[PDB]
Design a binder for this molecule. Structure first.
Ligand SMILES: [K+]
Ligand SMILES: [K+]
Ligand SMILES: [K+]
Ligand SMILES: [K+]
Ligand SMILES: [K+]
Ligand SMILES: [K+]
Ligand SMILES: [K+]
Ligand SMILES: [K+]
Ligand SMILES: [K+]
Ligand SMILES: [K+]
Ligand SMILES: [K+]
Ligand SMILES: [K+]
Ligand SMILES: [K+]
Ligand SMILES: [K+]
Ligand SMILES: [K+]
Ligand SMILES: [K+]
Ligand SMILES: [K+]
Ligand SMILES: [K+]
Ligand SMILES: [K+]
Ligand SMILES: [K+]
Ligand SMILES: [K+]
Ligand SMILES: [Mg+2]
Ligand SMILES: [Mg+2]
Ligand SMILES: [Mg+2]
Ligand SMILES: [Mg+2]
Ligand SMILES: [Mg+2]
Ligand SMILES: [Mg+2]
Ligand SMILES: [Mg+2]
Ligand SMILES: [Mg+2]
Ligand SMILES: [Mg+2]
Ligand SMILES: [Mg+2]
Ligand SMILES: [Mg+2]
Ligand SMILES: [Mg+2]
Ligand SMILES: [Mg+2]
Ligand SMILES: [Mg+2]
Ligand SMILES: [Mg+2]
Ligand SMILES: [Mg+2]
Ligand SMILES: [Mg+2]
Ligand SMILES: [Mg+2]
Ligand SMILES: [Mg+2]
Ligand SMILES: [Mg+2]
Ligand SMILES: [Mg+2]
Ligand SMILES: [Mg+2]
Ligand SMILES: [Mg+2]
Ligand SMILES: [Mg+2]
Ligand SMILES: [Zn+2]
Lengths: 134, 57, 74, 48
RNA sequence: GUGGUGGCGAUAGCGAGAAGGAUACACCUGUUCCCAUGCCGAACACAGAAGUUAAGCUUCUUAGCGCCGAUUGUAGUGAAGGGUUUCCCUUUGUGAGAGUAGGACGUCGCCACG
RNA sequence: GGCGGUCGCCUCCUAAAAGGUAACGGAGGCGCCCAAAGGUUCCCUCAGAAUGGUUGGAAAUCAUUCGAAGAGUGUAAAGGCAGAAGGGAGCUUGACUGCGAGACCUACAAGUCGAGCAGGGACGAAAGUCGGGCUUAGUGAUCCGGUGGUUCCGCAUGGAAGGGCCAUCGCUCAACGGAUAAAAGCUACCCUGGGGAUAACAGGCUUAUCUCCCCCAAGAGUCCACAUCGACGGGGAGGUUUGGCACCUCGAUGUCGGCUCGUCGCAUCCUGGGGCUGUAGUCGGUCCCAAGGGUUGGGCUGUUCGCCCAUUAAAGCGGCACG
RNA sequence: UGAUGGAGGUAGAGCACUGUUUGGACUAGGGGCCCAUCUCGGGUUACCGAAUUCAGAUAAACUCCGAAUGCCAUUCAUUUAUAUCCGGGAGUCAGACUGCGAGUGAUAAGAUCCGUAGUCGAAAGGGAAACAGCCCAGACCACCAGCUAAGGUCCCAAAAU
């Protein structure tokens, strides 16, 4: 996942304080994977979790990714001293706050949903808990 | 009626408005005491530095 | 490359609400009519609001979504 | 080619005004009715 | 009642529906007159009173939309601390946005003709 | 330090709801333009969309309806403006002269706003508006010169010469508060004053990188995730690498490799003990425990490293200012 | 300090604008196949799908909203004692860490650069084993007197085994 275009090539890292503004309830699927810690989630991590879920589901049911890596981050190469302007963009992250549902699933029995979301959670840098839609 | 205010905590390491409030009340050394009217202005001052003072009616 | 910025212009309110000012005193510096000139107040060539007489400054509402400065002599 | 010009008073020849014109859009000498401080009256002024 | 002209944040609006013209306001009838159209008497301007309430306009019904919006709770946060300190927590004050109970189809003047 | 970038001005974000606020922080503009794109008087309201319509096409012009601004505002952005600051038309030149109470800004020099007074006007019936433009960039001190004006001065006197005063012109003096009217390099032949205010070595902090160790387990393994290996991802430890910083040392902390002497860690090369094995045996693989001792000589290269020769139970990896 | 009145768009929040973005419905239009080909009209992948709409996210340079604080002001109130102005004399223009709010950096650095408060600087004393910058607290002096702060009370080592 990557935004097709961005208004600004470079952006502040920002801060992650408090619970997630939105997306704290399962909205489309039957089961959700809720973040319980705040952390940047990369588009590589989102993809690993997504493939881990869908494959176990055996292309069964539906998967919703509720987070998008809107935010870019830059780096400087080894041997580059401090200064001389912000580094070139390196990757994409979604800043995720505790309580945000990162993924939702439907169309599969609960046993598969719980194991599907377990395999995904091990791909993410954040601790997670399974959440049933209300 | 009256308020007896005593300075029980040091003013070292405190913001300027708190040091100036202590001085506005007429307090000096630690354990210095002063008697003031229980106006809204004086009670406001006590509230600003309540962590530094003890007050008696 | 970046590294440029214009000098700051010290815009905003220059006289307070309820303050007595002499005629000609600047009340508000602004780009555009962020605040409108009310009674006894004029607007300069660069949108600066100034008192036309001696009086007390009042920042007021102009209808629903606009503001206004006036000077009221005593 | 926008240029700076002087508007002289056609009556008393005092060079009273500093202004500018685009020569391409105004080939001929700019003529204006301007107040002459010397004569203290509005007089025809012409670029010189 | 209607026509002028104002103050008040649209609680004055919008949409839909209904009724009315006695006066008044309008459509309306004309281009001789002042005046007018980057063409057109459509408009503006002027002169006029056959018809019409059809529309505007006034009054009335509706909250469907827009607007207004208490209380409670929560986010944030001043001050005082704390921890397991990119964060988080306690105490004390303050306190939204959101979402809601609700309010509301206006109100206060002055003048003229009735 | 060099290379590159930057140097004055304007707008934004950073900037923490007054103002101000830094970085070789993140984005853009300026060194103009306009004789109307200025003033005033009067009048006007947009972009799009739907529907219909010759050439005519997605889209050129026309009509109706919808449409609160989704247009436009010369030129960047922000703030503003459709009671227009946007658009059209008539007449105009106020893109006036003398000024200017009082304010803003400000180290200074400057910069900004300004009611109002007088002179003489433009438009308007009048009220009234007008000292340029929606607002904020479009600029450059003094010295020295040019040009115009002048009831100023005129070295005995009259003149003149030459000055003054007012107006204006000549700056990519852009290193933009401008060292001179006028200026590029080499130094390992070098020298002095200083600095650990500031680099190279080593220490320190950091640990992205690096080495090692783990989590999840899609897969490989005939079958069989986990004998062995392990994608996509995730988490640590160490402080040997590549680096970042500039905190001790520049009134000097001697720099690679080797020799001599070792000493320590254990993420163990050999030897000792052990579990699992896709362990018949013999050889092995992998993990665990274990640092007691041991852990070769040569060819080439300054080398470390590495390749090679010949051995060996093995010929370990690191730390100790790369001892 | 209180009261009162104002300016200002940050925290948060929201999406009403602008960017970024998920799913659903439906769809102009868009890709190949056949029939019909003058390439002219269809029927399809639950083929790609504008725009619309429904639901759900996101933002330093987004805002229908919007605090706490801070700020300006008042012939205001209470306490307090400074404020300006004129002049003589300076020194300073390497700052450091800590907390908090940001940028740069890898939301690394005892890093760097601002804002804000404190301490150090230029501050001895007590605590943190030692430890400029942390916690408590400001040494004019004398005392073989008392009370406390941080921090403590089994022994080193004062005080609850
Ligand atoms: K995880
Ligand atoms: K008519
Ligand atoms: K009617
Ligand atoms: K209504
Ligand atoms: K005109
Ligand atoms: K210079
Ligand atoms: K040489
Ligand atoms: K590490
Ligand atoms: K490990
Ligand atoms: K097996
Ligand atoms: K040295
Ligand atoms: K060794
Ligand atoms: K074995
Ligand atoms: K050993
Ligand atoms: K050799
Ligand atoms: K050799
Ligand atoms: K060394
Ligand atoms: K939105
Ligand atoms: K914001
Ligand atoms: K600080
Ligand atoms: K001090
Ligand atoms: Mg600015
Ligand atoms: Mg101007
Ligand atoms: Mg609310
Ligand atoms: Mg602030
Ligand atoms: Mg500010
Ligand atoms: Mg214009
Ligand atoms: Mg003579
Ligand atoms: Mg002579
Ligand atoms: Mg300079
Ligand atoms: Mg030589
Ligand atoms: Mg020397
Ligand atoms: Mg020295
Ligand atoms: Mg140093
Ligand atoms: Mg050393
Ligand atoms: Mg430093
Ligand atoms: Mg020495
Ligand atoms: Mg071991
Ligand atoms: Mg926010
Ligand atoms: Mg530092
Ligand atoms: Mg010193
Ligand atoms: Mg001390
Ligand atoms: Mg010392
Ligand atoms: Mg004891
Ligand atoms: Mg006990
Ligand atoms: Zn003249």
């Amino acid at each position: 996942l990557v935004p097709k275009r961005v208004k600004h090539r470079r952006e502040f890292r920002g801060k992650m304080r408090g619970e997630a503004k939105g997306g704290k309830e399962v909205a489309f699927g039957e089961w959700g994977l809720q973040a319980t810690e705040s952390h940047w989630i990369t588009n590589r991590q989102i993809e690993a979790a997504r493939i881990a879920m869908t494959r176990y589901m055996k292309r069964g049911g539906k998967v919703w990714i509720k987070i998008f890596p809107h935010k870019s981050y830059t780096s400087k190469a080894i041997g580059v001293r401090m200064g001389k302007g912000k580094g070139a963009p390196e990757g994409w992250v979604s800043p995720v706050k505790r309580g945000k549902i990162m993924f939702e699933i439907a169309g599969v029995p609960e046993e598969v949903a719980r194991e599907a979301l377990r395999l995904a959670s091990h791909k993410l840098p954040v601790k997670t808990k399974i959440v049933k839609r209300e | 009626a009256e308020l007896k205010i005593t300075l029980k905590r040091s003013v070292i390491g405190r913001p300027q408005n708190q040091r100036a409030t202590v001085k506005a009340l007429g307090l000096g050394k630690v354990n210095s005491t002063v008697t003031k009217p229980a106006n809204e202005a004086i009670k406001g001052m006590v509230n600003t530095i309540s962590h530094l003072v003890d007050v008696e009616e | 490359s970046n590294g440029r910025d214009s000098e700051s212009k010290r815009l905003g309110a220059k006289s307070a609400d309820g303050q007595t000012v002499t005629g000609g005193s600047i009340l508000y510096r602004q780009r555009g009519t962020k605040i409108y000139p009310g009674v006894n107040v004029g607007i300069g060539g660069d949108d600066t609001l100034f008192a036309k007489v001696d009086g007390v400054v009042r920042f007021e509402r102009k209808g629903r979504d606009k503001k206004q400065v006036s000077v009221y002599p005593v | 080619m926008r240029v700076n010009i002087t508007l002289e008073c056609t009556s008393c020849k005092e060079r009273n005004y500093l202004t500018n014109k685009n020569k391409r859009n105004n080939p001929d000498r700019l003529e204006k009715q301007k107040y002459c401080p010397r004569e203290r009256k509005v007089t025809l002024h012409r670029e010189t």
